[PDB]
Structure formats: C-alpha cells, structure tokens
Design a protein around this ligand. Structure first.
Ligand SMILES: Nc1nc2c(ncn2[C@@H]2O[C@H](COP(=O)(O)OP(=O)(O)OP(=O)(O)O)[C@@H](O)[C@H]2O)c(=O)[nH]1
Ligand SMILES: Nc1nc2c(ncn2[C@@H]2O[C@H](COP(=O)(O)OP(=O)(O)OP(=O)(O)O)[C@@H](O)[C@H]2O)c(=O)[nH]1
Ligand SMILES: Nc1ncnc2c1ncn2[C@@H]1O[C@H](COP(=O)(O)OP(=O)(O)OP(=O)(O)O)[C@@H](O)[C@H]1O
Ligand SMILES: Nc1ncnc2c1ncn2[C@@H]1O[C@H](COP(=O)(O)OP(=O)(O)OP(=O)(O)O)[C@@H](O)[C@H]1O
Ligand SMILES: [Zn+2]
Ligand SMILES: [Zn+2]
Lengths: 466, 611, 464, 191
C-alpha cells in the first residue's frame, strides 16, 4: 500500500488509481498544503521508477535534494550546485537530519554519508560516492542511470550527450506537458493542479488566471513613446503552482519536446529513442534509451496523444486600460466533450452554450451530496470555454456551402485566398504532430568551474555535524 | 378535476350554499331548483338567419347559435321521451331534508413580489432544478426521438383472453411538430395511437376467481353493510326512503339535457336518428379510447423507466343519457343519512370547504390520511354485492337495478381501428356514470369497518374518491391485525402532524394560518413547476386560460402568514430547499402576455417533409 | 491531545477551524461571552502549531508580547517588553500578581527562577536577563535563534529582520491580518468572518459603511465654508475596530510586511531570505521566513497571493458630511455563493434583481438536529454593496465581446482608455504585485532611555 | 427601551399625543390666542425624565453624557494617572463597564469612543401635535436582530408605509416556540 497526503474525499483519487493500476492508493491527510495533487503524482512516479530498475546500480540526480533520498535502499549520487536561493536552506536541513540519526537506523550507511559530507567540506573539489558540488557537465562519476525530476533549466541535447560519454544508458524525466508551448500561446492553465502561467507582457490583464488591475475613469489620449504596433510572445514566462512562483524561459522548455528518434554526433556517435509511459491531465513520464553507433534513419516528427479535450481560442481583454486580443489554452474533461456533440451540429450563441455547460456540470457521482461534489470542471474557466465552442460551430458550417472540385486547386491567375481561423479543438482519441529537429552535431563546453560555497556557510555545517 | 384543473374548470361548482351571516351554525332546509322548459320555434330562426346576412357585427351571430342550440335541445327531449315509455313515471310527494350552514371564512392580506427580466426567471428555475435534481437536469442532449427508439426495440406484453391481427402490428412514426421547452424538466410527450401501445397498456393480469354469489360471499357483504349503518349513519330516514322509490321522470330528463353545452348537445343530436329503446341498449359493451396525457410526479423516475399508457373504457352513448337523471337524487339521499361530523365533497365549492374546517385543525394535532388505490377490487366478488345492498336500501326501483347490475359482471372491449378484442371479469373502474359514487361508498365502508367506533367520536372526517383524512387518529396494532385477515397491503396509511408534517389531500396542503388562526388549503407548487417544462404541440392556441389559472394560484401563495409554513411543508414532504425564489419566478411569468412567451422556443418538425 | 476553544457549540465557524488544522481535534468550551471569540481562537491554535515543529531546548525571542500569557509553557522564552503604550503598566502588574500567587503550588516551569529575575531588572533597568528585558527590538543584546511576531504592526519589517539576523536568528514567524486589501489602495473594507471593520480617517462621517456616524439634517441650498477640496485620495491614517476595541495604524508599516518571495539584505553582513505562507483562513495568514548568510540566486521582485474565497472591490456612492462623493470598498465573499451565480451573470441583471436572488440563496442548509432551523451563510449587511458589484461586472464583460480587435496589432491615434469600476477575483485564482526586493539602507538611532517611573517601581517591588 | 418597559422624554414634549410618555386632552380646534414671546425654536434642553415601570426619575443631560468615556484618557493634576475603559457584558441596551487605573503618563490618546451594535438601532423624524400645535422632532428605539435580517429583500425597492406595516405584523407573530398554548408570542411590542 502507498499513502498519499491528500483529502480522504476528493475527485482526484479516481484519476490516480486509474493511472497507477499496479499499486494501492490510501488517503491520509496531515497537512493542508495548497499543491497536494502536484506532490502526490511525483511521489508515485518516483516509487514506480525505482521499482522498474534492478538493484545494485548507481543513479545520478541532477536537481537533487539530499534529504529526500536519505532513507532509500538504492545508491544515489547527488549533484548539488549552489545557483539557487533554495540551496543554502536544503544543505543545512540535510546536515541536521544526518546528525539527528546516528545510532537509531544502522541500515542505510549513515556513517558513510557523514564521512563523505565532511570530506567534501574540507576540499570543495573532491569527488565522493554520494555528494559533490559540480554541475551536470563538470561531474566525472561513472554510472548507468540518470533521473530528472522537475528540471527546466538545462538544454536537453547538451545534457544528455555529456551523460552518455560516462556510460549512462537510461534516463527518466518527470514534469509538465510541453504541448501548449509548441502552439505559440500567450497564456494557459492546468485546472487539475491549480497551476496558472502567463506571459510577462499581459501581467496587467483583467479576466485571466494570473493578473491584477486598478480602477480608472477613462482618458482619451496619453503620452507615450514610439509606437509598438505589435504583440508577440517573448522568451520570459512566469509559472504559479499553488502559492509559489517560478520563472521560466520558452527556449529551454521547448527543448524537451524530443522527437521519436534522433542521432547525437560529435566525438562519439549514439542513437536515441523517446517514449511516454504515464500521462495524467498534464503530467507525463518519459523514458530515454541510448546506444553507441549509428543505425537507421530519422524523420524528425513528434506525436502527442490526447486522452482529454484540448482547446485554444482567441479572446479580447483590456490590458492596462487598452483593448487588445491574444490567445489562451486549457484542458477539458472527456465526459463534457462527449455530451456536447449533439448541439454543435447547428449554430449557437455563446449564451446558449454557457447555459448547457452549467446544467451539465453539477452532475456528479455523489448526486446531491456536496462533499465529493467538486464539479467536473472549475467554474472560473466556463465563460471562455463557451465562446470557443460557438466559434468552432460557425467555422464548421461555412465549409459545407463551399464544396469544391475533387483533386484540383483554384487560383483566381495568382493570389489564392486564405481563410480565418479563430479556434483549435482537439477531440479525445486524436493525435497531434509537429516538425522538429532530430540531428545535433554542435557541442561546446565552458571547461571553467567556479565555486559557490562561502566561509560562514561551511563553518555552520561543520558545527552542525559536530 | 375536483378543486381545479390546469385550465381552471375543475369538478366542483362555484356557488356557495353553506354560508351564513351569523357567528353560529344554523340548520336550514334543502330546496329545489326550477328549470326553464325549452320551447320550439322555427319562424324566429328563418327571419333571424336572413337578418344575419344583411348585418352582423358581433352579437348578431350569437343570436343564431342560441336559437339554433335551443331548437336542438327541444328536439332531443321529444325524441328521448318516446324511447323510455315503459319506464316513465310521474312526480310523487317528496321527502324533506335539512342541512347545516357555517360562517364565512377570514383571509390575510396578500402582497405581490415579482422580478423584471423574464430571462432571469428561467435561469433561477434552471438553477433550482440542477442543485436539487442533478440527474433530471442532464437528460436532454438531443431532440425528442422517443417514437423511433420505441420502434427499434420489439414489443413486450402480458395479455390474457385477447385476440389481435399480427399483420397490423407496425409502428413507424408519423409527423411530429412541437415547441422546444425552456425549463429543463423532461416531461414526455403524449404517446402515438398504435397497436404496440395498446398491447403495452393492457399488460395487467388480475385473473382471480372466488365465490360468485354463493353463501360465503353474501355473509361478508351482510357484515359490511351492518358496520356502515352502525358506525357512520344515524337512524331517522331509512324507513321513509324505502317506501318511496326512485324512477325515471320527465323532469329528470328535462333538467339534465338543459345543462349540456353547445357542442355536447350537437354530438348527442347526431345519434338520435336510429334511436334504440332503453331495453335494447346493451349494458356490457364498451369501446376503447387512448387520447390522454401522461401523469408525472416530482422526483427522478421518468428518466429511468418509461411511463405507462392510460386508457378509457367508454360505454354506450345512449346508456349514459337515459339514466343520468337520478344522480342528483342519490347525492341528496346519501347526505341525509350521514352523521354531522362526516362530510362528502359532493355539491360543494372551494369556499364552503374552507368554512367547514376553519376552527378544527390546530398545531400539534394528529391527522390520519389513507388511500385505497393499491387494492385489487377484482379479486373479491363481495365488493360489488356491498354496493348493490347499499343502493337497494337507498330506494332504487327494482327494474332499474337489473340494468345497473348488468354492467358489473362480464364485459368486453373492442378497438375499432385494429379490430382488437378484450374480455374482462368483475371490474370497478370504468367510464359509466356511477364511478365516483360507488368508489366513495366503498371508501367509507372500508374505513368504518377497520376503525370501528373511533370514526364516530371524531372532530372532522372527509371522504372523496380514493382519498380521505380523519382527525385525531393514530396508527396502532389493532387496525393492522383487523386488516391482515387476507393480506397486508390493502391500504396505505400515513401519519401527519399539523405545523410539523403538513397533511396531504387531493394534491394540496392543509396549513394553519398565523395572523388569523384558521385552517386553509393551498395547491402544490412543485407539481406546477414540473408542468411548465412540458412541450406544447404546434397549432395550439390555449395559452390564455393557463395564464389566468396561474395568476389566481400565485395570489393565494403570497398571503401573509403562510410563507414560512409553506417552506416547511414542502421540505418535510420532498426534502427540497429554496422554493420562495421559484414562487417569485412564477409571479413575473403570469404578469403579461409577452412575459408568458419566454417559456417556448422555435418549432421543431420530425418525421415530416419529403425534403 | 484535544484542544479547547472558547467558541459556542452550534456555530458555523467550527467547520472552518477544523479544515485549517487537520492535524488536531477541536471541541468547543464556552466560558466567556467575548465579542471577538473567533479572532482569539485562531491565535490560540496557531501558537500550539508553531511550537510543535521547532527543536526543543532552544531559545525563543518574543517581540512586544505580554509575559503573562507565557508562564506555564515548558520552553525557553525571552520577553522584549518596552514601555510605549497604555497597555503595558496593566500587563506588568498582572504578571507580578500571578507570579507571586503561583509560588510553591507549581513545582515546575522554573517558577522559583524567574520570580527572582523580575526584581533584579527593577533594581537596575539596564541589565539583560534570560527571561526578561526592557529594551526595544533593535536594542536587546540577547542571542537566540528563533523569533516570533504576533499581531505586530508598528515596526518596519526589513529593518527589524536585519537586526535579528545579526544576532544569529535563522527562523521567524508572523501572525496577523492579510495585507492584500492595502495593496489595492482602498478607502474602506471589512472582514465579515471576524466582525472587523476598518475605514480611512476622511470618511468617518459616512452613512452606509461598516464604521461611520452621522446626524439628521434638513438641507441647505448652497453653503459656503473656509475649506477647499476637489481632492479625495487615501492618506496615511487608518482606524481598525475589532469587536469593541479600537486600534489606530499607518499604511506604510502595513505594506512593509507584504514581502516578496526572495529578497536580499545588504550591509556590513549579507543574507538571503525567503517568505512562504503556511496557513490561511478567511483573512488570517501565517508566514514563515528563513534566513541564511551569503549571496545566492537572483531576485525578480514579485508577490503572489492565492485566493480560496472570492475577493471583491467596487466603486460606491455615499454622502459624507452632507456632501455626495465616491470611493472604493473591498470585501470577501464565500466560495459557495460565487459558484452558484455563474449561470445568472450570463444575462443582464439590474441591481434590484440581483439583490433578491442573493437573499434567497443566503438562508439555506436549515439544520434541524443541530443549531437553529434558520442559518445564514454570509452577513446580511454586506449584501447591498455586493449585489451592485455583480451588475457592473456583467455589463463590462458583455461590452468587450461586441468590440473585438485584430490578432497581434494594437491601434493608436496615444490611445483611448476604457473605464473600470469593478475588480473580481474568482476562487482558485492568483494575483501578482510588484514590490522592492533589494534593501541596503539601515538606520540605528539607539537613543534608548528608561521609560519608567518611580511610583510604578515601588508598586511592583512591594507587590512581589 | 422596550425590553425593560422604560420610556424617557424631554420636558418640552410632555404634552404630545403618540409617544410612550405623554398626556393630552380633547379639543375642538379653537383657533387664535396671542402672546408676546415668540419661540420659533424647538431644541433639546438639560432636563430629561425617566420612567421605569411606575417609578419616575429626573436626570440631567450633562451628567449622563459624562459617562461615555473613550478607550484611553489621562488625568492630570497634583498626581498623574493613565487609565482605560472596557465593556464586558451588554444585553439590549443595559451594559456593564470596567475601568483600570495606573499611576504615571504612558502612551498617547486619540479621543474616540466605539459602540458595538448586536441589534438594530433606529433614529427617525416624526410629526406630532404638542398642545394642539403641529411640530416635528426625532425619536430613537431598538429593534430585534431577527426582524432586521428578514426585511433585507423588501427594502430593495420603493415601499409605501402602509405596505411595510402589514409585512411587519405578519413577521411579528411566531409559532415554533409557543408550545401550542402561548399562541401570541410577540417578538417585539406592538406599540
Ligand atoms: N515550473 C516549476 N515547477 C516546480 C519546480 N520545482 C518543483 N516544482 C513543482 O511545484 C510543486 C510544489 O513544490 P513545493 O513543495 O512548493 O516546493 P519544494 O521546496 O521543492 O518541496 P517539494 O516539491 O515537495 O519537494 C512540486 O510538486 C513540483 O511539481 C521548478 O523548479 N519549476
Ligand atoms: N489591528 C490590530 N489588531 C490586534 C492588535 N492586538 C491584538 N489584535 C487582535 O484583536 C483581538 C482582540 O483581542 P483582545 O480581546 O484584546 O484580548 P487579547 O488578544 O488576549 O490581548 P489584550 O489586548 O491584551 O487583551 C486579538 O485577538 C488580536 O487578533 C493590534 O495591535 N492591532
Ligand atoms: N547544471 C545546472 N544548471 C543550473 N541549475 C542546476 C544545474 N544542476 C542542478 N541545478 C539546480 O536547478 C535548480 C534551478 O536553478 P536556477 O538556475 O534555474 O534558479 P531558479 O530561478 O531559482 O530556478 P527556476 O529557473 O527553475 O525558476 C537549482 O536548484 C540547481 O541546484
Ligand atoms: N520598536 C518596538 N519594539 C518592541 N515592541 C514595540 C515596539 N514598538 C511598539 N512595541 C510594542 O507595541 C505594543 C502596542 O503597540 P504600540 O506601541 O504601537 O502602541 P499603540 O499606538 O497604542 O497601538 P498600535 O500598535 O496600534 O499603534 C506595545 O506593547 C509596545 O511594547
Ligand atoms: Zn558528482
Ligand atoms: Zn533582552
């Protein structure tokens, strides 16, 4: 049995059980965290990964919290640079836990861990079988398994290549789905995990999931600088999971949307694959296998399978008192989409679509009881979804009165006309395909390392371990 | 029906006869109503018809129909009188009767509260349905293809002693046009007239055989009439009534026919050419009629199982016209022999009922309500003997009894469109002109026998149809043991307490006022609410009688001192909260003609049009 | 293990407390009819939670606390009690009376130790003691590792935190009201779940707000005075009213506690800090702050607030001192009410219609076995202002759909600005603000003087 | 104060017609009479009469208002003190207060007094005939909390005084607590 720290009566139990049929999930709540669903999936995923691989193998952790892998029966080697504000707190916590258990559990090599930690504090540049202060590039430890857990700050082709030359043949990745960022969207949401993300240029919106605005009366004309006349996505994106803020970049996010098969050239050559194992309403688990040599050929295509509804439409909002338009995206439950196919055969107004969605939402498993009746979908996304369906139905009609010849195109001499597109709707049991790059032969190493540890921090750890 | 229907026509009258201008009860005498004898005149019609052509704005036409209908009524009397020459009699001296009167009721002031936007009213009603009834609010996802789905699956039936032609069992749907409803209640449309529906309706199996007219049957009937006459009637009229029979009389026919309306008189006139004599009309032959409306109750049961099909067994048209002049006398005689504390809804109005129970029901009082619908009256032949014994004691003339008895034995029914034949044994429910009277008599007899002397010592008892309410009676093991002689589910009983669990009677609630301190009866709001979600057939122009009925019912709901009581009564019965907003929504709907148009939508046509 | 609170048995606030503290069991026990029972219940449970995770045998610093409330605890506390309010002399006398009366009977909690330390401080008012002190937060010299702030709004957070970290403090806690409404520049607001109202000093003569007072008048058709206005903007004077108690406060000190996620403190020594929110319940929040020496990471300067209940802010018209003006009011709305209004707001609703629906939806539940048959989800006196806000929100949303622009480009003339009258934050939505995350200027006057009097000294010595 | 059967009035309106403490006599409407003094002003004076049941007490406005102490205030003279005032228990307008005094000057004052309302409070303008002459003044009273809650919906529109009177009467009679015998169970006095 596996115990999760979520409420004993919630709609997320069914999804977790369906995605993990080889376990038994039992709820046991001890803390009112605001991101319980996010932590529950990660706990189950890491338990499955360590169970799928054989024992007596060495494992690397790129983004590692040493206190998390302290009571495990495996062999973890942690790579812990000092480039984040979280790092000093985590290191002190790790030292306190080690010193607080020295004669209670003599089964996890506690004495070795303390000895390895002390050696590193003496010489920062030394390497130990358990701890080090290098990066994913400067580390020089041999193993065969690597694990990535919620890592978005590295370049995937470069990081994978440096791990291969050290004898690693298997890798794992756990994180958010990167499909919405391949469609070049402006904002989006993950309703099941209370996650909202938005571009930096629309942080002063009015009716989106992450914005803030003031009260104004209205003025005609304002002083300004040279006209922009453009509104396009930029490289900076802000994430908000629960009540915690994370900044991200678009280029590093799209680099993890790896193709089905790709080649890694350079000094040594390898062939690679990529498969998706677990998918649940936004989280995915990916497995990568690597082998020396060069075999076969590459097509440079990526495929995503949709078990739920995916929507992307165009909306009008007032940003800092000025009316503009951009695009958003979200997810829809499968049951809602299946029951809306009878009304989309004709043209409907947004008001009528909204009324049907509301009436179809309160239908819950526990019927009139409001304990487990958390509704099928969150109510704050209904207005925008209703508009998307109305636009889709209108566009699906005009195609019917403009039938053309079978086989030939039409140019009216030159200048063939393009049509309007305001919504994209991917129904369940469909697939999406994009074109990407599948050949990399450009690798560069800085070959320079700078320490990040300080004197007062080193003294505190030594005192704690005393 | 009884109090009032959807169109505000009801079964009760609208004239008060039980009202007095004094603060005490006064006994009075029952009188007779004189009827104007119709007369024949043809010269007036000829000149009026010619004067109709030259000028007719609005009232000139009305004089023609009045003259024309009056001529028809006189012709019917002349033809009908000649048929029953062997049964016609004269007027004998009458037996006087007396009745009790009550003071007028007192009502609290009413204040009207309504919204403005009619679309908001629909949203509130839809929100109310979804919150309380989740499954009902998500059924409708497409059009009404019920007829097609019934054809795809086969026909399942449970028949007995029936014949039909298999070559005519085909149920392809016909054209169907209606208006899309706005309220999300899924009230079904009336069924189509097919052979499949007829067999589905007649899936009842009541094949039970007992002693027809033997000694054990007579003994049970003899005891039943003894209990009725000992615990529910006084002894001051039996010997006088037996001496004076009741026979067919010219005054009975003249009064009856004059009360018919225009279209009814014309239909009867069309069947007077080949007029059969009274002794030639069969009394055990019926026809089958299907045109009805489905009955739905609050809850979630029609979204899971298909409802049943209602049928009507119509008797001979001449049979119900020759003998229908004796109903008034039977009602008068029955009211004369009953105890003062036992009442019957016959020959009353809405106001009279309120005045009777004005000062009897108070909070903290136990009321027993019992219905006898769930009972197989065809199993025992003694239920028919008891009614005949009561009828004979009331003073019915002997040859007339034989004609009545012929309709309570073996009967047959036929479906004209398909030539389907049905046979039934002893049956109580039918379409004859003694159905409410016999049911009321049996209801009183059953209650009297079970309750014994507890019925005599009571404050107020009311009996009508298959429903009854008795004051100050609780449920004990004595009535269970008495009623368990044969089985246990003969009747259904429910205990009610005033101001805690409101009693239910004839689709209404009995509540005690707070400002004045008197009892009153109001209608059921949830029953109305589900009814507005019923589709309207195309070509119907009856959207004005319903608005007036809703307006009258809304006003009675908003009386001061009854808002809080109505909230608790509905919750204790259906376990639903938030009905004040629904009542307010109903108020704005019944305010104008255009406000009533928001309950309909665009016309949808199915199975029609070769395009 | 069970926790006792002074809350009436059949009250609706018990459910909220149980969900906010799932690791405890709460059962009511009422002995006092206080007017702010809900406010004290949260603070009692918060202290029990905080002391449970901290490592025992560790010293804790208290800033501006009453030593009386912490006498039976089995921890080590250092009370910092200056003399700058009308409350302090009463608290000191009560502490001495309880301490003297507890001698001998309680053979634990170091009663005999600290009973002799109070007199030592009274002898010389400039000495440190492991139990008592008489300096300010920036003048104490005791060294510890944990600091606790409870209902403190009279200090500058960047300055106070820096001084505590110099002495070697690596953890801090804060308990108090949410500071979100004061980042929106509002004039008046309410906390309906805790019976708390607050208003600006310029609108104390209003008529239809939470905290105001006015008088009857007949009307003067034109009155000339010696005051010039045509300005109405918030100032640095706010009045709080919790139950029947009044507290004057300032906006600048309130906004200083709305710390970002990551910030740097630079000076003679340097530290990096973080701020997380642990417990939130309808207005009360608990914040945990960790500090560490050195320079690490990067800063962005943003603050994030997560809404579990609806947050509303609208514009209202009232009459102040006989004159008609307009300002802004903010309040909180329960989640269940917001969810049931989704279908109605799609249409056009007048303020009169919206008010009637809210009243019908308010009285519900109707428990018979528990409490009373009539129960209200939200306070009735805030319904009129709430119903007005929804009407304005529905109109603005409809006007945007009727005027759609092109994708990508914005049209200039240098542009026209539309009007906004309502801000509505639906449940499960986050709001983001921009603040300062780099502090380098710190001033330490340290002109401390003994704020004490001879008559008070005589009373304490003789009573003890 | 309806819950305690207490009525108070100013000395100048003792001859009113429709208040809780007044007395008058029948008159036919004799118009006229002249004098020298011209009032033209009707304002409160320093004379108030109290009536608790059948007992009469005369009071003064100045001394009554002197007990409305603020949260904090200072006493200055030969000796200096600082002190507070708090409210402990209140029940429909009859309260208990506690004052604690300490020697010395600490803190600063603001000069504000706060009152918490657990039930409705009304002050309106009324018209009445004092000694046969029509005048206008102000009256105050207390209202039960449950009555104020149930009137929220009606006050959303414009309502005539007669309609409001009928609604209030219907809400006054209450039945759940009568015990089937008390019947009347008035929530508030009808006068
Ligand atoms: N976009 C993004 N999400 C992250 C990152 N790190 C963690 N998350 C996710 O945020 C969720 C909440 O994490 P928190 O508990 O608040 O922060 P924490 O200190 O890392 O603690 P744990 O996640 O429980 O190990 C995690 O479950 C992750 O799924 C990150 O670096 N970037
Ligand atoms: N705005 C503000 N609120 C406070 C302050 N101090 C306390 N509060 C809150 O007001 C509530 C009223 O508490 P009290 O009835 O005065 O009793 P107490 O909390 O034990 O503290 P004392 O004032 O010493 O009696 C407290 O529970 C606090 O939540 C303050 O200084 N400013
Ligand atoms: N090679 C690496 N480069 C950068 N970070 C690494 C590397 N290896 C591990 N990490 C860890 O990744 C985490 C993210 O560090 P980052 O530089 O992105 O700062 P951040 O802004 O706080 O995080 P984020 O950008 O995801 O919001 C750090 O804790 C770091 O220890
Ligand atoms: N710099 C400080 N360090 C420690 N405690 C302080 C400091 N300033 C004020 N206090 C404490 O705050 C408590 C009361 O608040 P304060 O001193 O501001 O008086 P106040 O004006 O009456 O109330 P308010 O806090 O609302 O301004 C006092 O007990 C005081 O000891
Ligand atoms: Zn390493
Ligand atoms: Zn100190």
């Amino acid at each position: 049995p596996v115990y999760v720290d979520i409420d004993a009566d919630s709609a997320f139990l069914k999804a977790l059980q369906r995605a993990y049929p080889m376990f038994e999930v039992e709820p046991r709540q001890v803390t009112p965290n605001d991101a319980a669903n996010a932590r529950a999936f990660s706990h189950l995923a890491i338990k499955l990964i360590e169970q799928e691989i054989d024992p007596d193998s060495t494992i690397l952790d790129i983004g590692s919290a040493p206190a998390r892998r302290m009571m495990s029966d495996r062999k973890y080697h942690c790579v812990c640079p000092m480039r984040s504000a979280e790092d000093p707190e985590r290191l002190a916590n790790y030292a306190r836990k080690l010193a607080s258990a020295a004669g209670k559990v003599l089964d996890r090599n506690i004495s070795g861990k303390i000895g390895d930690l002390q050696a590193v504090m003496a010489v920062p540049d030394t390497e130990t079988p358990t701890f080090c202060l290098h990066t994913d590039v400067s580390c020089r430890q041999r193993a065969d398994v690597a694990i990535y857990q919620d890592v978005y700050a590295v370049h995937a082709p470069t990081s994978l290549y440096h791990q291969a030359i050290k004898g690693v043949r298997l890798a794992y990745w756990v994180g958010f789905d990167t499909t919405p960022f391949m469609y070049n969207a402006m904002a989006g949401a993950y309703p099941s995990y209370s996650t909202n993300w938005a571009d930096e240029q629309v942080l002063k919106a009015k009716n989106i999931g992450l914005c803030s605005t003031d009260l104004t009366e209205g003025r005609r004309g304002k002083l300004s600088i040279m006209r922009g006349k453009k509104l396009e996505p930029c490289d900076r994106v802000l994430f908000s999971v629960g009540s915690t803020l994370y900044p991200e970049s678009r280029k590093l996010l799209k680099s993890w949307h790896l193709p089905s098969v790709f080649h890694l050239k350079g000094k040594l050559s390898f062939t690679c694959r990529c498969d998706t194992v677990v998918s649940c309403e936004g989280y995915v688990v990916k497995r990568i296998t690597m082998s020396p040599g060069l075999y076969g050929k590459t097509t440079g295509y990526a495929v995503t399978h949709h078990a739920d509804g995916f929507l992307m439409c165009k909306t009008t909002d007032t940003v800092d008192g000025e009316r503009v338009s951009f695009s958003v995206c979200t997810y829809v439950p499968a049951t809602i989409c299946d029951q809306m196919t009878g009304i989309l055969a004709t043209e409907v107004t947004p008001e009528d679509a909204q009324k049907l969605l509301v009436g179809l939402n309160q239908r819950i498993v526990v019927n009139g009881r409001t304990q487990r009746n958390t509704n099928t979908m969150k109510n704050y996304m209904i207005p925008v979804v209703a508009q998307a369906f109305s636009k889709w139905a209108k566009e699906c009609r005009k195609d019917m009165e403009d039938e053309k010849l079978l086989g030939v195109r039409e140019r009216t001499l030159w200048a063939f006309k393009k049509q309007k597109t305001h919504t994209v709707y991917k129904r369940p049991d469909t697939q999406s395909i994009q074109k990407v790059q599948a050949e990399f032969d450009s690798f560069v190493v800085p070959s320079l390392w700078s320490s990040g540890l300080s004197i007062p921090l080193r003294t505190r750890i030594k005192w704690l371990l005393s | 029906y009884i109090f009032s229907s959807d169109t505000g026509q009801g079964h009760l009258q609208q004239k008060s006869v039980r009202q007095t201008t004094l603060p005490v009860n006064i006994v009075e005498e029952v009188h007779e109503e004189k009827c104007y004898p119709p007369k024949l005149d043809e010269i007036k019609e000829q000149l009026l018809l010619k004067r109709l052509q030259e000028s007719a704005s609005t009232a000139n036409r009305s004089r023609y129909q009045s003259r024309k209908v009056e001529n028809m009524k006189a012709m019917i009397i002349h033809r009908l009188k000649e048929g029953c020459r062997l049964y016609l009699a004269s007027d004998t001296p009458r037996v006087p009767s007396y009745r009790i009167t009550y003071p007028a009721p007192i009502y609290s002031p009413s204040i009207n509260i309504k919204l403005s936007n009619p679309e908001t009213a629909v949203a509130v009603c839809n929100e109310f349905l979804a919150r309380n009834y989740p499954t009902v609010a998500s059924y409708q996802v497409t059009d009404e293809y019920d007829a097609y789905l019934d054809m795809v699956d086969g026909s399942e039936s449970c028949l007995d002693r029936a014949t039909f032609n298999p070559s005519k069992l085909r149920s392809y749907p016909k054209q169907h046009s209606y208006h899309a409803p706005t309220i999300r209640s899924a009230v079904p449309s009336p069924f189509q007239n097919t052979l499949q529906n007829v067999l589905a309706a007649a899936t009842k199996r009541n094949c039970n055989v007992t002693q027809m007219r033997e000694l054990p049957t007579m003994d049970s009937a003899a005891f039943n009439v003894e209990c009725f006459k000992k615990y529910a009637c006084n002894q001051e009229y039996w010997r006088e009534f037996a001496s004076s029979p009741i026979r067919v009389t010219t005054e009975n026919l003249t009064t009856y026919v004059t009360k018919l309306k225009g279209p009814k008189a014309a239909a009867l006139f069309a069947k007077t050419h080949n007029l059969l004599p009274l002794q030639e009309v069969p009394m055990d032959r019926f026809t089958m009629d299907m045109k009805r409306d489905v009955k739905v109750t609050p809850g979630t049961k029609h979204t899971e199982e298909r409802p049943k099909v209602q049928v009507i067994q119509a008797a001979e048209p001449l049979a119900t016209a020759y003998l229908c002049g004796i109903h008034r006398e039977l009602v008068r005689r029955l009211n004369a022999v009953l105890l003062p504390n036992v009442h019957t809804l016959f020959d009353m109005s809405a106001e009279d009922f309120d005045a009777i129970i004005a000062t009897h029901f108070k909070p903290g009082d136990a009321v027993l309500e019992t219905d006898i619908a769930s009972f197989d009256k065809s199993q025992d032949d003694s239920l028919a003997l008891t009614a005949m014994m009561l009828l004979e004691d009331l003073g019915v003339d002997q040859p007339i009894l034989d004609l009545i008895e012929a309709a309570f034995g073996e009967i047959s029914s036929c479906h004209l469109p398909t030539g389907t034949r049905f046979k039934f044994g002893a049956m109580m429910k039918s379409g004859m002109f003694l159905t409410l009277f016999v049911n009321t008599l049996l209801n009183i007899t059953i209650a009297s026998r079970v309750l014994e002397e507890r019925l005599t010592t009571s404050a107020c008892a009311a009996f009508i149809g298959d429903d009854n309410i008795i004051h100050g009676v609780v449920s004990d093991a004595l009535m269970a043991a008495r009623c368990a002689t044969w089985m246990n589910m003969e009747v259904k009983i429910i205990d009610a307490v005033v101001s805690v669990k409101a009693p239910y009677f004839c689709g209404g609630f009995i509540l005690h006022d707070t400002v004045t301190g008197t009892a009153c009866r109001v209608a059921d709001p949830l029953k109305r609410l589900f009814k507005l979600g019923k589709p309207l057939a195309a070509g119907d122009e009856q959207d004005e009688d319903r608005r007036r009925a809703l307006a009258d019912e809304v006003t009675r709901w908003q009386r001061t001192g009854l808002v809080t009581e109505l909230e608790r009564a509905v919750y204790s019965r259906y376990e639903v909260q938030g009905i004040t907003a629904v009542i307010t929504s109903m108020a704005t709907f019944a305010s104008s003609k255009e406000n009533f148009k928001k309950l309909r939508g665009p016309v949808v046509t199915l199975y029609g049009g070769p395009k």
